[PDB]
């Protein structure tokens, strides 16, 4: 069944599961042809496959060559996503394979279902939550590795850095979704908050800055303010 606010804590139990987001798989800049018509030029994309309990991120980079000479790319993108997620599962040891895959957009259900026919016991679930994973390309190190790729490539990250040494998965996921919601609603402001003062750094092996617990509270507050603001600036409230 569908994943929502009611069953939100199921994300952090001990059954292995993955979120799959396909927003950033097929990415285009739309431009004008010399004849004044409109054309798209693809740029590199990525599948965002995330274990919400552990933070392990399987970032499958989607190189623009995969679209060469293909038609109906937005439809292909969903099937390519499902082919790549199925290949990732088959690559994992049995004891690491997920018991559920939650897709962030319902149009991935039938593509993923058909590719996972060999895995009748892996449940493919939609969700009622409006998760901000599209904003993953606002994380500088993820964007950088996608755009630099010259061939198809899988890159592994922990999207929680070292947070789980100090906080629970539930709290880590909440922080992640707050950060990404903020980058999605006003990327410029969000990045200013993060990269604020010159005594705070990002470790070479991390994605986010090395905030103390107290600074994270301050940061998280600032991100909440931004999100409500933009919600006023948008709606005039």
């Amino acid at each position: 069944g569908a994943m929502n606010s009611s069953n939100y804590a199921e994300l952090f139990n001990n059954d292995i599961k993955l979120f799959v987001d396909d927003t950033n798989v097929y990415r285009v800049t739309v431009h004008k042809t010399f004849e004044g018509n409109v054309a798209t030029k693809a740029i590199n994309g990525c599948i965002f496959t995330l274990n919400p309990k552990t933070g392990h991120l399987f970032l499958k980079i989607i190189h623009t060559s995969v679209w060469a000479g293909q038609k109906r790319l937005s439809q292909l993108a969903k099937w390519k996503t499902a082919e790549e997620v199925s290949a990732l599962v088959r690559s994992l040891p049995k004891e690491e394979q997920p018991k559920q895959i939650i897709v962030t957009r319902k149009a991935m259900l039938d593509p993923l279902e058909v590719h996972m026919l060999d895995f009748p016991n892996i449940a493919i679930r939609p969700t009622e939550l409006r998760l901000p994973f599209s904003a993953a390309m606002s994380i500088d190190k993820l964007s950088d590795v996608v755009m630099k790729a010259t061939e198809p490539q899988m890159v592994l990250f922990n999207i929680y850095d070292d947070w789980l040494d100090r906080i629970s998965s539930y709290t880590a996921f909440s922080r992640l979704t707050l950060l990404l919601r903020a980058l999605k609603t006003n990327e410029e402001s969000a990045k200013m908050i993060l990269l604020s003062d010159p005594t705070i750094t990002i470790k070479s092996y991390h994605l986010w800055p090395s905030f103390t617990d107290e600074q994270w509270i301050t940061i998280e507050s600032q991100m909440r303010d931004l999100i409500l603001t933009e919600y006023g600036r948008k709606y005039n409230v």
Binding site: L76, W79, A82, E83, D110, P111, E113, V114, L117
Partner: protein, 300 residues
Amino acid sequence: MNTVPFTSAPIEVTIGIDQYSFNVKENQPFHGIKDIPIGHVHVIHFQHADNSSMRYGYWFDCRMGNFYIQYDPKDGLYKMMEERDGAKFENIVHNFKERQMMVSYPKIDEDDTWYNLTEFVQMDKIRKIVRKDENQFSYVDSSMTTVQENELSDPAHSLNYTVINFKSREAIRPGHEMEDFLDKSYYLNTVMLQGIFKNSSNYFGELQFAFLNAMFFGNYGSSLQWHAMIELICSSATVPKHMLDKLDEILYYQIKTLPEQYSDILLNERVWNICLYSSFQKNSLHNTEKIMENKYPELL
């Protein structure tokens, strides 16, 4: 012309024969149905006046034996039976025919409806879908479920239609996932037509039988099966030209024969809107599209 005689009619019942029907009163002197066209399967069916629950009936072919009906007061229904004494049956039939205690199968000469609804339906294929090999005829009723419905409970009383499932390994070639899901031609032509049904006539026979069980008994699983068999053809980019033309004729007469007051339950919006207006064959069903639009434009 052949005859399906009755010992008596002890309970008030509406009796159907193919697309015809008449009301028989409790203990009215009814003794059967005569002038039944040879060469086609037929279905005699029943709806009791007191319990409109359970429409039930019998598929039969007068070429395969002499069949007669006696009400069973223990099991509470009109049963079909097979007489083995050919002279008893003929003396009995003739006797009743002289007392004019039979209704005449009321076929208008111009009328090809029944032929067109049963063109590809054979008793031999019915008896494989409805397994009861000690009888030449086949019982079907409102409540019987299909093999496929059971997989998702009494196997002896099941409709063994061919299982169709668009998200299944049988339907999707490893490595052609997207290709086969968006264009079912592989599954139609290789798996089902070449592999399972052997030819399109047998495919059309099962499609027509499923429709008729949906129409005459309100059998839900049969309606599911009819729509699935239509959708598999409509969602295939590559269909023999002869099948497409005949499918149009088939569906035309099915929609033409459907009671106007039943389109709400027996017609699946999504299948028909996909089939007539989006699928590969959206433009290959002119006669069916025409009568669907002049007769059920609400559904669409």
